[PDB]
Amino acid sequence: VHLTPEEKSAVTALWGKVNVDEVGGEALGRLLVVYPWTQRFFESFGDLSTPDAVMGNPKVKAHGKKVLGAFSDGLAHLDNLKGTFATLSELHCDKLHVDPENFRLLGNVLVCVLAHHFGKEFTPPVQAAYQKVVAGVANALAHKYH
Amino acid sequence: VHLTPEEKSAVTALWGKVNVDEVGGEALGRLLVVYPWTQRFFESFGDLSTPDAVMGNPKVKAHGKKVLGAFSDGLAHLDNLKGTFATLSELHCDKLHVDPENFRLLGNVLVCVLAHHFGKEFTPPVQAAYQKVVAGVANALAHKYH
Amino acid sequence: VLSPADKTNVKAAWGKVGAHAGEYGAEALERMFLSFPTTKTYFPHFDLSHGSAQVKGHGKKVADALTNAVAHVDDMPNALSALSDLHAHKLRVDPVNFKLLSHCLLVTLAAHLPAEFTPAVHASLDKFLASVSTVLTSKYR
Amino acid sequence: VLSPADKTNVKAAWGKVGAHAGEYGAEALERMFLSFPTTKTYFPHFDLSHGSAQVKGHGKKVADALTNAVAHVDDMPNALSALSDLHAHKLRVDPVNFKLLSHCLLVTLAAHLPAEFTPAVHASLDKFLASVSTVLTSKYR
Numbered sequence: 001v002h003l004t005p006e007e008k009s010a011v012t013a014l015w016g017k018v019n020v021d022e023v024g025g026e027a028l029g030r031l032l033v034v035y036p037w038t039q040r041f042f043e044s045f046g047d048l049s050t051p052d053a054v055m056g057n058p059k060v061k062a063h064g065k066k067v068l069g070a071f072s073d074g075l076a077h078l079d080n081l082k083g084t085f086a087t088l089s090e091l092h093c094d095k096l097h098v099d100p101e102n103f104r105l106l107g108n109v110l111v112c113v114l115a116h117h118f119g120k121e122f123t124p125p126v127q128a129a130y131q132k133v134v135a136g137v138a139n140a141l142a143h144k145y146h
Numbered sequence: 147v148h149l150t151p152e153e154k155s156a157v158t159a160l161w162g163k164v165n166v167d168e169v170g171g172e173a174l175g176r177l178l179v180v181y182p183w184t185q186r187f188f189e190s191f192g193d194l195s196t197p198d199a200v201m202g203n204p205k206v207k208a209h210g211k212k213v214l215g216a217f218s219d220g221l222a223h224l225d226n227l228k229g230t231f232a233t234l235s236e237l238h239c240d241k242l243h244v245d246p247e248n249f250r251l252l253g254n255v256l257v258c259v260l261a262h263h264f265g266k267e268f269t270p271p272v273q274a275a276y277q278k279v280v281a282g283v284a285n286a287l288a289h290k291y292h
Numbered sequence: 293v294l295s296p297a298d299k300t301n302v303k304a305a306w307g308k309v310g311a312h313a314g315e316y317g318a319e320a321l322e323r324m325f326l327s328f329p330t331t332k333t334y335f336p337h338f339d340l341s342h343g344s345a346q347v348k349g350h351g352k353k354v355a356d357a358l359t360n361a362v363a364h365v366d367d368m369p370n371a372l373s374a375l376s377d378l379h380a381h382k383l384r385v386d387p388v389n390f391k392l393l394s395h396c397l398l399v400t401l402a403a404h405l406p407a408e409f410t411p412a413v414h415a416s417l418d419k420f421l422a423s424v425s426t427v428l429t430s431k432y433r
Numbered sequence: 434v435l436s437p438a439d440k441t442n443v444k445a446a447w448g449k450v451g452a453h454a455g456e457y458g459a460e461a462l463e464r465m466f467l468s469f470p471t472t473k474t475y476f477p478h479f480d481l482s483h484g485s486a487q488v489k490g491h492g493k494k495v496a497d498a499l500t501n502a503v504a505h506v507d508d509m510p511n512a513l514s515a516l517s518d519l520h521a522h523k524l525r526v527d528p529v530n531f532k533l534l535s536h537c538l539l540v541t542l543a544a545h546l547p548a549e550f551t552p553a554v555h556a557s558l559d560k561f562l563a564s565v566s567t568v569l570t571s572k573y574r
């Protein structure tokens with residue numbers, strides 16, 4: 001991503017207040033509840049039957065932590081997302097064969113979550129900025145789909 | 147895109163049988179009929195009132211020529227599609243603001259149109275090769291969105 | 293689908309919005325403009341800057357509609373015919389932009405309903421909005 | 434939004450389809466697996482080779498289901514219930530894929546029904562298929 005330095009600041013500054021142990025889950029979990037065809041990728045996590053089934057699942061929460069990990073990771077290297085997500089595009093496009101529009105989805109729920117956590121602190125402009133971070137990531141993971 | 151030789155060949159082969167003055171307009175035409183919101187871009191063309199109207203508009207046929215042409219430089223430059231389509235990308239993204247999904251749509255119909263003319267010849271494997279190209283092409287036009 | 297369950301939270305949350313509706317529609321618009329500028333292409337006769345009365349007024353219009361839609365959550369088709377014609381035949385809005393404005397709707401809802409934005413509610417507000425979009429673009433069918 | 438004009442056209446094309454329905458249906462799959470490999474992913478237990486009697490066998494089923502929809506064209510949601518369930522809940526197909534399969538059916542319909550395959554008709558089928566799909570995924574939204 002590009003990101004003007006005021007976006008740069010903004011974004012960055014936001015992330016620093018994010019409880020990774022917890023936002024990572026909100027996100028992944030909500031994706032599994034909102035876009036339920038996504039579940040098929042996680043048969044293994046067990047019961048995903050319900051919002052509650054989904055939210056209390058540790059496996060899920062555990063995994064959500066891994067995802068925001070890559071998020072900060074990527075976030076840190078906006079200049080060169082491709083390098084950061086190399087292995088990612090692979091696992092995802094190559095091994096899992098996940099449709100890329102889904103990656104798009106994960107980003108928006110992440111956005112929705114931030115909004116949920118920060119409320120008014122999450123301004124349109126800020127939202128705009130992350131929206132760029134998100135697409136940027138999404139694209140990177142698709143790459144190995146060419 | 148990639149293609150095999152025998153892939154890259156048969157595209158090239160069939161493309162040879164293509165009546166240029168026609169195909170372009172059939173394609174562009176059918177797009178404005180099947181996905182009517184695309185008309186917004188082509189308001190100046192005249193009467194798009196009906197299929198026949200659209201199917202017969204001369205600004206429509208003429209522009210179709212221009213379009214099929216681009217597919218042609220593209221066919222000749224399967225690797226450098228990116229570079230090939232770069233000026234068009236600006237035009238399309240930056241100045242026109244067409245949504246990228248619209249390129250997939252256009253290519254998809256070019257395929258129905260090819261199927262339409264070539265019948266049995268347009269075998270699955272031919273479509274598959276052709277599918278690649280259309281996608282490569284779509285991407286390439288969407289670049290400045292990335 | 294707007295299962296009965298769905299119709300509920302929706303009414304719950306929307307009701308919860310109440311008089312703030314207009315301000316939020318406005319946010320949601322503003323949000324879209326900034327985040328997806330391709331969308332500004334459709335409101336050339338508007339001043340789209342942050343102040344923007346023009347936008348505020350439009351926010352109210354859209355907020356108001358989502359409302360009558362919540363109201364007739366059952367029959368939104370007869371409820372939105374007027375809007376559908378306008379968007380599909382008159383403006384030829386590209387369908388995709390509905391997905392956009394809806395995301396910004398969700399994102400506006402979330403920000404003002406901290407206690408209220410649950411995974412379940414989130415999901416129900418997502419389907420309501422999607423449905424609306426559908427009606428909104430059904431003339432392209 | 435399957436106007437009569439629409440239903441008619443659908444009817445006719447499928448009409449002209451007749452018995453070939455099975456092989457046509459088969460045709461679209463193979464076309465699909467070939468043009469969008471990613472979808473093979475749902476057919477592990479399958480022989481997805483050039484002449485699979487499975488693929489032959491499934492093609493019929495799909496077509497049969499298509500015919501049936503055609504027939505209860507204004508009661509799809511009902512004529513398709515079972516299938517909707519299998520597709521959403523049990524198989525959980527990425528909705529995205531329906532767009533692929535339907536593009537493949539068209540392409541096939543065109544290469545077999547040139548004379549019928551006209552603008553107006555192309556538009557009608559697309560809408561048809563659009564609906565069938567919509568219905569097949571209603572179990573999500």
Ligand code: HEM
Pocket residue numbers: 038041042066067068070071091092096098102103104106107138141
């Ligand atoms: C959108 C941004 C995403 C990020 C940053 C991300 C990140 C990750 C990471 C870090 C792993 C595990 C890698 C490891 O530790 O070896 C993983 C695995 C996985 N991801 Fe994602 N993911 C994303 C999107 C998605 C989406 C949209 C889906 C499907 C809907 C998905 C499905 C999976 C699955 C099924 C695994 C399983 C790997 C395992 O079980 O070890 N991912 N992802």
Ligand code: HEM
Pocket residue numbers: 184187188212213216217234238242244248249250252253287
């Ligand atoms: C899909 C692949 C496409 C190709 C290869 C293509 C090619 C072209 C070409 C060659 C031009 C004219 C530039 C010149 O004068 O040299 C053009 C212009 C234009 N294109 Fe496309 N196009 C594509 C898709 C689309 C789509 C999907 C839309 C909107 C639905 C669209 C809308 C336009 C419009 C409205 C113009 C008018 C240019 C002007 O006269 O200002 N194009 N395109």
Ligand code: HEM
Pocket residue numbers: 331334335353354357358375379383385389390393394424425428
């Ligand atoms: C939930 C989705 C939407 C709702 C509920 C909605 C609702 C409305 C309403 C209530 C109006 C005013 C009607 C009147 O003049 O009486 C309107 C107009 C308009 N809408 Fe939408 N709309 C939606 C989606 C969109 C989208 C996605 C776009 C594309 C950016 C869009 C662009 C416009 C434009 C340009 C106008 C015209 C305003 C004017 O004439 O000054 N709408 N819409």
Ligand code: HEM
Pocket residue numbers: 472475476478494495496498499516520524526530531532534535565566569
């Ligand atoms: C036009 C839309 C579609 C129709 C009419 C349709 C119809 C059917 C039917 C009739 C069956 C089997 C019923 C039985 O066993 O009695 C089936 C199964 C299946 N469908 Fe579809 N389908 C459609 C779309 C899709 C799409 C887009 C996919 C994604 C790849 C898909 C994947 C499958 C799979 C994997 C099976 C079951 C294979 C098995 O028996 O193990 N379907 N479908």
